[PDB]
Amino acid sequence: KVKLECNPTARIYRKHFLGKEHFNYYSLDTALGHLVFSLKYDVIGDQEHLRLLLRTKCRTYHDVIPISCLFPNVVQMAKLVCEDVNVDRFYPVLYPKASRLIVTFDEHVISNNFKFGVIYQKLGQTSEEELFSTNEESPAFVEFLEFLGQKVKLQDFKGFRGGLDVTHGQTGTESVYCNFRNKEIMFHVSTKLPYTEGDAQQLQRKRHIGNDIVAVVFQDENTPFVPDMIASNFLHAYVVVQAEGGPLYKVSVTARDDVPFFGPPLPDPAVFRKGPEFQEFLLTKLINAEYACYKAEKFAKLEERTRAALLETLYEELHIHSQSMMGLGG
Amino acid sequence: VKLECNPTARIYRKHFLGKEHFNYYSLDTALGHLVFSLKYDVIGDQEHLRLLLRTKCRTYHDVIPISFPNVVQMAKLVCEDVNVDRFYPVLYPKASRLIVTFDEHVISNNFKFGVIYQKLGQTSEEELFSTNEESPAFVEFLEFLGQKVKFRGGTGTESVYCNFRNKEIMFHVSTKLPYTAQQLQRKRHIGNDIVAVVFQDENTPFVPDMIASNFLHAYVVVQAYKVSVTARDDVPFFGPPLPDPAVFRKGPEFQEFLLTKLINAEYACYKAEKFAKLEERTRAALLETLYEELHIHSQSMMGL
CATH class of the missing domain: 3.40.50.11210 (Rap/Ran-GAP)
Known part of the structure; x- marks a missing residue:
């Protein structure tokens, strides 16, 4: 029946981007930190839409905006989904495995x-x-x-043990x-x-x-x-x-x-x-x-802290591999 | 059993279009304009790579089961004659559409x-x-x-x-x-x-x-x-x-x-020998045009 309550943006790469024609870009914002940005051009009838997903240290923003031949550049698209972005340029992710690194990041939550x-x-x-x-x-x-x-x-239980003793009965x-x-x-x-006894x-x-x-x-x-x-x-x-037996x-x-x-x-x-x-x-x-x-107070810090480190690792890898894509050594 | 049209011309549509692929381009001081398509694809156990290299008269197709190689080497694996300084990436969201049409023109x-x-x-x-x-x-x-x-x-x-x-x-x-x-x-x-x-x-x-x-x-x-x-x-x-x-x-x-x-x-x-000049004449012309479009829209998505 109804969807489980995780961050609803964590699904988007999987439902809309992965396996389909799209572009990822990176860039470093002095205020927002590492940016990882996904954009994807879609068509239905003569209705050209544009779906955008920009990742920051804190949030990932999402939106689908109608486009109409009357075409934005990446910096500009970024600004359409995250007003605060302010960066001279974005850089294309040229690494053929980025999308698999990326979805994992998105779904880490x-x-x-x-x-x-x-x-x-x-x-x-x-x-x-x-x-x-x-x-x-x-x-x-x-x-x-x-x-x-x-x-x-529990003795030889191959499922998730949630910390229980799976091998000594303790x-x-x-x-x-x-x-x-x-x-x-x-x-x-x-x-x-x-x-x-006694405890x-x-x-x-x-x-x-x-x-x-x-x-x-x-x-x-x-x-x-x-x-x-x-x-x-x-x-x-x-x-x-x-x-209440009375069996409710x-x-x-x-x-x-x-x-x-x-x-x-x-x-x-x-x-x-x-x-x-x-x-x-x-x-x-x-x-x-x-x-x-x-x-809640107790976990929010640890979550933030984690999202930030994953994103940096992600950013660094999309950057190192794109570099090796264009001409690191040949 | 299909129709004897150039076999390498059904490929962009069958394998690339609508799936994650990459298109680059270049200026070969020997082969003029170029339009390279590459696609990574994990067939469960083993990872296969696919290539589609366009020149002003031939397109070269190949499929490598790889074990990770840079852009040019991927090109050099389908057309050994390539000799460029660097390939440039298409960033135009409307490019695959122009590419299948070019590919499909014959x-x-x-x-x-x-x-x-x-x-x-x-x-x-x-x-x-x-x-x-x-x-x-x-x-x-x-x-x-x-x-x-x-x-x-x-x-x-x-x-x-x-x-x-x-x-x-x-x-x-x-x-x-x-x-x-x-x-x-x-x-x-x-x-x-x-x-x-x-x-x-x-x-x-x-x-x-x-x-x-x-x-x-x-x-x-x-x-x-x-x-x-x-x-x-x-x-x-x-x-x-x-x-x-x-x-x-x-x-x-x-x-x-x-x-x-x-x-x-x-x-x-x-x-045939009479149907060379028009094939080279059209293919080159069409490619020259598609290269320009790929260039102007990609620069535009960023710089000029």
């Missing part, structure tokens, strides 16, 4: 692996101590787990996991990870669930749960699922003030029944929560 | 063929053009050739036309055309032609020297059908090979063979 935690909340529980020290798995809890994904043994003997759209999701199920704060469970960004909190009974309940550097958004799952979302709105909108009477609709809703909602969390 | 979309009727013994021009009436066997072959109709091909009461690959072809049936001093009104059409069919009711020698035409180079002789081919030492082999029992079964498979052969006959005679 779509992630294919996800790891989410699953905590079970007892009726009274209000502490990490109570929240992780839980051994018995509820009937409702099993039934929900069967629903999230498939149970897998992080439980099983987990729940699943292939989603084309993603791999490993769950960190609190009750499936090892329990420790109330249960490190062997927290070291995984505490390093996740998004978790599901399953409840058998309605109980309060705020993020202030768990001390974590990573946990940012939570999806609470409560099983009552669903809610909490996440720090930091994280913006995400995922499929919760339905209006906000309750689901066990089935595909819910599988779809919940899984996309978890992925959307994670993409939303990446906008 | 593909004749139109054909005009002639039908001469040799009455047994007719040996001179005045005679083989004199024939005003049509014999039963000639009409039975003419209605077989294509369909009767009232692409003109440059008149009279009627003539024959037929569609083949998509190309239109009008015939000039001497007899079906107006009768006037040495039949100038039949030579106007059949003369300016290049391939003609000679139909005969009975066998008689036919030889191209029997008609004074600077243009006609080849004839497919059909004798009520015993098909033979006659053409100048100038013109190479063409169309599908002729069959072992040289005869031709009247019908679907025959017409097919014939129409292709006539076409291929023309493309053949276009390789």
Whole structure:
């Protein structure tokens, strides 16, 4: 059904440019930094359009502007999509593999692996101590787990492990996991990870669930749960699922003030029944929560910093190879 | 099994157009203007490169399974004669369109063929053009050739036309055309032609020297059908090979063979010594023009 919430510009090279006639150019802007620019001339009927995608240290800009025989140069096209660009010239990317380097850069922000935690909340529980020290798995809890994904043994598991021990049994003997759209999701199920005699704060469970960004909190009974309940550097958004037996799952979302709105909108009477609709809703909602969390104080810096270094590497390589294309040595 | 037009002329469209490719150009102090097309293409396991090098008379095509080489070397791999300072890149968003047209220009979309009727013994021009009436066997072959109709091909009461690959072809049936001093009104059409069919009711020698035409180079002789081919030492082999029992079964498979052969006959005679000057003259001229356009628009996308 509906597209996953990554930066919507990361798709454009793939849907519109790759495999099709187009041009890439580079240039260095004193303010904007390294520029990597893609442009592509398109025709439908007698309607000549122009699709532009300019990459900066910070953003990539996109637009499709009608052109009409009544033809711009690259500097000028650049200015049509990013007003601030101000550069004497652009340079043609002549390296026959640029487009493969480029798409990878563009897509560096779509992630294919996800790891989410699953905590079970007892009726009274209000502490990490109570929240992780839980051994018995509820009937409702099993039934929900069967629903999230498939149970897998970790011993020789070839899928995405999300940090679990795949070869020595030291992080439980099983987990729940699943292939989603084309993603791999490993769950960190609190009750499936090892329990420790005398370690109330249960490190062997927290070291995984505490390093996740998004978790599901399953409840058998309605109980309060705020993020202030768990001390974590990573946990940012939570999806609470409560099983009113009466077989409806009552669903809610909490996440720090930091994280913006995400995922499929919760339905209006906000309750689901066990089935595909819910599988779809919940899984996309978890992925959307994670993409939303990446906008918060904690991660934004690291993201920026990363985009910048990838772009520079990209720019430098499009530059080195274009040079070797025109006449480095012959 | 395709039509004998220059094979390297279908390639830009089949492989380059609409896919990621690069076009450069240059000024060979020996081969004049140049227009180079190159394309990288990963065939799963192994990576193959494709080249299309244009000169003022030849285009050179080649396909290298490479293991990464610079621009010139890519050129030097298809035409060893290249010797430039540096290739320049086309940056004109509207270039591939100009390039396929140039590449495609030697593909004749139109054909005009002639039908001469040799009455047994007719040996001179005045005679083989004199024939005003049509014999039963000639009409039975003419209605077989294509369909009767009232692409003109440059008149009279009627003539024959037929569609083949998509190309239109009008015939000039001497007899079906107006009768006037040495039949100038039949030579106007059949003369300016290049391939003609000679139909005969009975066998008689036919030889191209029997008609004074600077243009006609080849004839497919059909004798009520015993098909033979006659053409100048100038013109190479063409169309599908002729069959072992040289005869031709009247019908679907025959017409097919014939129409292709006539076409291929023309493309053949276009390789002749009289059809050099116009081929070099046109190709060069067209290239010179395309090089200018490629240059002015590319400079424009940047500097001048």
